[PDB]
Design a binder for this molecule. Structure first.
Ligand SMILES: [Zn+2]
Ligand SMILES: [Zn+2]
Lengths: 228, 115, 215, 57, 392, 256
């Protein structure tokens, strides 16, 4: 579970080996957020309170946990999960908040406390135009980022209003994933794995014998991609 | 006890007892009598091995998990070329490595234990 | 019903053979033919008509004068008795003790079947200057001294012990110690203060001799 | 996913909570002492400043 | 070169195919379970065995392909640094990463890394590095290698302290053991723990491994190599070996001496067989007879053609005198004499084996002066190899 | 095994009947406390043919056991043997009936004549009623080892033999099992070696254990050092641990 959070082969040798750990690059720590807006959102969208919940005549109900506190049950977990994810990607909910859904355990957990370690990740969405899953970030965003990176050195006019990392987070192209959320997502090692699923299957091709031999593209249900 | 007998009155469960004179086992509550014939030979069942075909909760949203691997095994009933497979959920070394295939079209669970 | 009877007969025969071997190794007179007796004529000469084992199999030692009397002039006669009742109480060993007293035997060996009481154990060390030894059939099924890891143990006389102490210029406490409850010590019937010579094979020298004193 | 890291956040929060609890105890003792006559907080917080600075340092 | 890497890749692919076939067989419940273990343990053992065999085969192929001018290979032959496993991991393939003696455990829920699917038992997902250091490592195998290295570092860090404490305790336990002037080892209290040091009274630094020729071999070979009869002709002695040839035949004293020596030799063989059930012949012994006889052959130039000067009586008497001259206890009473006699039984057996009359008269052809020099050197070395009293 | 029956797989398998096969819990699948006041009749149609064959005496409570195919090999299809073992272990007024390997569904019927009394007796029959074997033994694995037995012609040759490896330490009772060699039985635990053997045997076992410990790194240690260590550890009549409770509790000087 230390992948992308703490640096491997960094701990000092001796009696502190494996105890003194250093944070990896592109790793942040949440500061904490009040969960009251999330509770109000859950109640408004339709969520049975725990007071009137009975386990009988309701075997498909999924328990909802906020900051480790059981608040009620939900009969339609998938739509609630989609709505919460859309709200988080739109900036309505703080990106530091982590929401995890357990399909088999029928549990939905939301954490808004502090001390959690998260790292940014790319977002993969289905593209009907290309007929296969593709990254939500395209060449236009890269061009805008490069233009705003080259603009500050020489100054200039308003340009694109300083398209920055906050703009990427607001647009939903990049989202924060902590250790808990990594338990129910599929991550592609490189964007080159987001090719068509067939990828010219059963077609022999020549490769460089001096290059690394790798195995990938075995799954077509990718949800995230590593930045690097 | 495969099933638990609950008193119709109140909500406590029923102790086992024998009528002696009638030579018939009867279940009786303690808050109230609630005497009935208790026509059930089952008094106690003990289990020692894992149940065959334990599978899991197999909720209707089992196909929405992106981490579940997919295969092309033929569905016995609907003859679909798509499904999701997972191993047994028992948490010890006694279980085998059999795979349970779940079709996302007809929600039918079929195993690969050809034997 | 035949399996248990055959198992008991075989165990009793093995225990009898081990007892005979122990008596022979202790320095008494036991013929080599009696040591290795076949099961068929053992059952013919013992047990009963129906095949039930019989515990009326007792022997008396002789203390041969060839080497045993010469080495230890104060060696008497030994009586070995097998208890018939399963669990030995206090009365049965009382009869055994007064039978030993009437027959003035120097040494007596009792072999119980399953268990023995603490009061029974307390009764045992009360006959001076004689000695009473208690053994278990389960422990006597297999001879310990026949194992490949058990070297030869030879008891040393008083003169030999004195000569060894004088030659090596050692005290009694300046010797390796062996517990009185050691299986080999019980096999040899070692007393307190006796010295036993141990000969074992070595990978650096062909032979090596070591001495231990019973404490 | 079941462990948290304590930055210069809740640690300083706990330190300040303990210091402020000591402050509340001291000022309550002073207020109880001053029931006879007069009540001035200008000098009652010299020890407040001393404790707040000293504990943190 | 290209063909070697192609062969390595083919071997790795074949191993992966075998692993996949094993997984498919196990998933269908068609794989029998070895007695004493469950299906999972047997499956894991088969997988790790296949992976290790593939890695070893690839490493052997890479080592074979390397030429004699290779610097790493040249260092390997010299033995100064490097090994076969280093060449394998550096050129052909890295071994399967293991933590706590098993493959990479499922840190996540039925997954090793978030980039894999659930219930994936393929070797790549469980920590098999099919690449090499020269080729480079993918991120997953890089993480697995980092985990293995961390486990190794933690193991050494714990082990150094544990062995240090163990060494301190062991030193404290035996810090007062003395070898005294009576060739007995005693503690501070004077209690005797060993009546003779090492059961032989020999210094550790003056012992060399030697082979006993009597224990090994067959009965016919032993008789041919040792039995000599001056009356019959089956094992007769060549008269040209010694100057007294054609005259020792028909004698009775020489014949009885020879058969007494043969009886002693077969008794020694029986004793050695009883002592060593496995029949091992290479055992450490104080004095190296072979070096002494080789030196005595190099000096006092042996013609290898002229008849020898030694007689049977001279050889037998010299051997007996050498046996009697070995002192390790120097006592007068019966007990010390017996201890000295039985503390040199192995050395006496070796000396009898290496100084037989037939061996001297056929292979180690020496003269009377050479034989006397050999005996004196053996006695001096044996007396100088005794443990000095007062050693800790 | 015995020297005569050394390379005999069948003899090794027969001797392997010393592992404690545990109670019926190792072979049963379920247990029932079915109530039936009728002694000679039962409500279960399956348990009727055996009652017909069979037919302070009436038992209103009935207890049933169901086994599986694991008894065919581990228990060598001991159909009546388990019933006889239950009879001897319980006795008193315990009415137990076992199917004679005839019906596919094997039922071990049990009854007792004088509902909580059935539970305790069933629990006791579940864990501490041994059928066959030696206690403190749970896994025996057969191996084919090679021994350098001298040839009749004089040379030394490798003679393969069957060796039984056990995961338990009960050598006090294992040595009494017929068909094995009591003069060659070895245990890696030297603590209980001198319980049945002598102190010298314990010292030899300890030396062998130490030599096996220093065997894998490839380092060679002279015999004198290890012999001295094991002699110091066994100077008295028992094991003397290298700790504060072992060699420390001696008569040496207080300062040292
Ligand atoms: Zn009621
Ligand atoms: Zn289907």
């Amino acid at each position: 579970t230390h992948w992308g959070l703490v640096c491997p082969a960094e701990t000092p040798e001796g009696q502190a080996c494996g105890l003194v750990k250093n944070l990896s690059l592109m790793s942040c720590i949440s500061v904490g957020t009040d969960p009251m807006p999330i509770i109000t959102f859950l109640s408004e969208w339709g969520m049975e309170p725990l007071e009137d919940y009975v386990p009988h005549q309701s075997p498909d109900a999924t328990r909802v946990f906020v900051n480790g506190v059981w608040h009620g049950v939900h009969r339609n977990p998938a739509r609630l999960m989609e709505t919460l994810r859309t709200l988080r990607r739109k900036g309505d909910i703080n990106p530091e908040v982590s929401m995890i859904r357990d399909i088999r355990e029928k549990e939905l957990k939301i954490f808004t406390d502090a001390g959690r370690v998260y790292r940014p990740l790319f977002i993969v969405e289905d593209d009907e135009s290309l007929g296969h899953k593709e990254l939500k970030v395209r060449k236009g965003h890269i061009a805008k980022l490069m233009a705003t990176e080259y603009q500050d050195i020489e100054g200039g006019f308003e340009d694109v209003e300083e398209y920055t990392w906050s703009s990427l987070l607001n647009e939903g192209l990049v989202e924060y994933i902590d250790a808990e959320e990594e338990e129910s997502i599929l991550i592609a090692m490189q964007p080159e794995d987001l090719e068509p699923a067939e990828a010219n299957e059963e077609n022999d091709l020549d490769v460089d014998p001096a290059k690394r031999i790798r195995v990938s593209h075995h799954a077509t249900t990718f949800t995230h991609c590593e930045i690097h | 006890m495969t099933t638990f007998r609950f008193c119709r009155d109140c909500n406590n469960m029923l102790y086992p007892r024998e009528d002696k004179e009638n030579n018939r086992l009867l279940f009786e509550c303690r808050t109230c009598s609630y005497v009935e014939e208790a026509g059930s030979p089952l008094v106690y069942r003990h289990e020692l091995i894992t149940n065959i075909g334990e599978t899991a909760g197999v909720v209707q949203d089992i196909g929405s998990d992106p981490t579940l691997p997919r295969s092309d095994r033929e569905c016995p009933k609907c003859h679909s070329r798509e499904n999701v497979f997972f191993q047994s959920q028992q948490r010890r070394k006694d279980t085998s490595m059999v795979l349970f295939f779940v079709c996302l079209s007809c929600s039918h669970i079929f195993t690969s234990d050809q034997k | 019903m035949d399996q248990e009877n055959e198992r008991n007969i075989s165990r009793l025969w093995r225990a009898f053979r081990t007892v005979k071997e122990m008596v022979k190794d202790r320095g008494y007179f036991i013929t080599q033919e009696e040591v290795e007796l076949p099961l068929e004529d053992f059952k013919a000469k013992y047990c009963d008509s129906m095949g039930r084992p019989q515990r009326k199999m007792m022997s008396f030692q002789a203390n041969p004068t060839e080497e045993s009397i010469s080495k230890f002039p104060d060696m008497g006669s030994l009586w070995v008795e097998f208890c018939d009742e399963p669990s030995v109480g206090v009365k049965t060993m009382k009869t055994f003790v007064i039978h030993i007293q009437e027959k003035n035997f120097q040494t007596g060996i009792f072999v119980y079947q399953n268990n023995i009481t603490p009061s029974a154990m307390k009764l045992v060390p009360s006959i001076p200057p004689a000695t009473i030894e208690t053994f278990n059939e389960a422990a006597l099924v297999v001879n310990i001294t026949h194992h490949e890891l058990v070297p030869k143990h030879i008891r040393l006389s008083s003169d030999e012990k004195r000569e060894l102490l004088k030659r090596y210029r050692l005290k009694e406490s300046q010797l390796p110690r062996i517990q009185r409850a050691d299986p080999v010590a019980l096999y040899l019937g070692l007393k307190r203060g006796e010295v036993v010579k141990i000969i074992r094979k070595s990978e650096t020298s062909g032979r090596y001799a070591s001495y231990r004193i019973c404490m | 996913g079941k462990k948290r890291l304590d930055l210069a956040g809740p640690l300083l929060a706990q330190l300040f909570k303990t210091l402020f609890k000591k402050l509340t105890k001291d000022i309550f003792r002073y207020m109880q002492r001053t029931v006879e006559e007069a009540h001035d907080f200008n000098m009652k917080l010299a020890i407040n400043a001393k404790t707040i600075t000293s504990g943190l340092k | 070169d290209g063909p070697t890497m192609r062969e390595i890749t083919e071997t790795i692919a074949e191993a992966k195919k075998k692993v996949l076939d094993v997984t498919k067989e196990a998933q269908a419940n068609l794989l029998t379970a070895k007695h004493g273990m469950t299906l999972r343990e047997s499956f894991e053992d088969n997988v790790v065995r296949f992976l290790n065999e593939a890695r070893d085969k690839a490493g052997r192929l890479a080592e074979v392909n390397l030429k004699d001018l290779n610097n790493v290979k040249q260092m390997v032959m010299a033995g100064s640094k490097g090994s076969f496993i280093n060449i394998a991991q550096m050129s052909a393939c890295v071994g399967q990463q293991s933590v706590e003696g098993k493959r990479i455990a499922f840190g996540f829920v039925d997954r090793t890394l978030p980039h894999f699917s659930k219930d994936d038992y393929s070797p790549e997902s469980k920590g098999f590095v099919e690449n090499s250091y020269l080729r480079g490592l993918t991120p997953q195998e890089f993480f697995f290698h980092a985990m293995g290295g961390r486990e190794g570092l933690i193991d050494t860090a714990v082990k150094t302290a544990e062995t240090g404490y163990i060494q301190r305790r062991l030193v404290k336990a035996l810090e007062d053991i003395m070898v005294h002037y009576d060739n007995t080892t005693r503690n501070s209290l004077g209690n005797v723990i060993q009546f003779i040091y090492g059961e032989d009274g020999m210094d550790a630094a003056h012992i060399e491994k030697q082979s006993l020729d009597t224990i090994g071999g067959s009965d016919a070979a032993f008789e041919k190599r040792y039995r000599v009869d001056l009356l019959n002709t089956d094992h007769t002695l060549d008269p040209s070996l010694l100057e007294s040839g054609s005259e020792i035949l028909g004698d009775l004293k020489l014949q009885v001496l020879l058969d007494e020596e043969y009886k002693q030799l077969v008794k020694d063989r029986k004793f050695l067989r009883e002592v060593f059930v496995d029949g091992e012949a290479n055992w450490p012994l104080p004095v190296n007879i072979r070096r002494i006889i080789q030196n005595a052959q190099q000096t006092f130039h042996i013609d290898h053609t002229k008849p020898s000067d030694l007689t049977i009586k001279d050889i037998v008497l010299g051997v007996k005198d050498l046996q009697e001259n070995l002192l390790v206890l120097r006592g007068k009473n019966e007990i010390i004499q017996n201890a000295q006699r039985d503390a040199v039984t192995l050395f006496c057996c070796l000396l009898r084996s290496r100084l037989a009359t037939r061996r001297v008269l056929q292979e180690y052809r020496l003269t009377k002066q050479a034989f006397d020099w050999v005996l004196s050197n053996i006695e001096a070395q044996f007396l100088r190899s005794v443990v000095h009293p007062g050693e800790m | 095994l015995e020297p005569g029956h050394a390379a005999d797989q069948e003899q090794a398998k027969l001797i392997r009947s010393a592992i404690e096969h545990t109670t019926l819990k190792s072979v049963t699948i379920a247990s029932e406390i079915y109530y039936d006041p009728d002694p000679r009749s039962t409500v279960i149609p399956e348990d009727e043919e055996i009652i017909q064959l069979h037919f302070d005496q009436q038992s209103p409570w009935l207890l049933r056991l169901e086994l599986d195919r694991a008894a065919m090999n581990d228990k060598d299809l001991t159909m009546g043997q388990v019933g006889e073992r239950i009879k001897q272990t319980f006795k008193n007024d315990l009415f137990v009936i076992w199917s004679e390997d005839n019906d596919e569904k094997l039922i071990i019927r049990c009854r007792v004549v004088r509902d909580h009394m059935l539970k305790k007796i069933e629990n006791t029959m579940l864990e501490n009623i041994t059928l066959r074997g030696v206690e403190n033994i749970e896994r025996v694995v057969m191996m084919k080892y090679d021994r350098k037995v001298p040839s009749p012609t004089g040379e030394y040759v490798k003679e393969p033999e069957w060796v039984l490896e056990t995961d338990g330490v009960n050598l006090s009772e294992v040595m009494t099992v017929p068909g094995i060699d009591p003069t060659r039985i070895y245990t890696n635990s030297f603590i209980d070696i001198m319980e049945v053997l002598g102190i010298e045997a314990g010292r030899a076992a300890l030396y062998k254990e130490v030599y096996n410990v220093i065997a894998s790194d490839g380092s060679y240690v002279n015999y004198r050092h290890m012999a001295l260590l094991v002699d110091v550890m066994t100077t008295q009549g028992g094991l003397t641990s290298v700790t504060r409770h072992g060699f420390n509790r001696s008569n040496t000087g207080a300062l040292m």
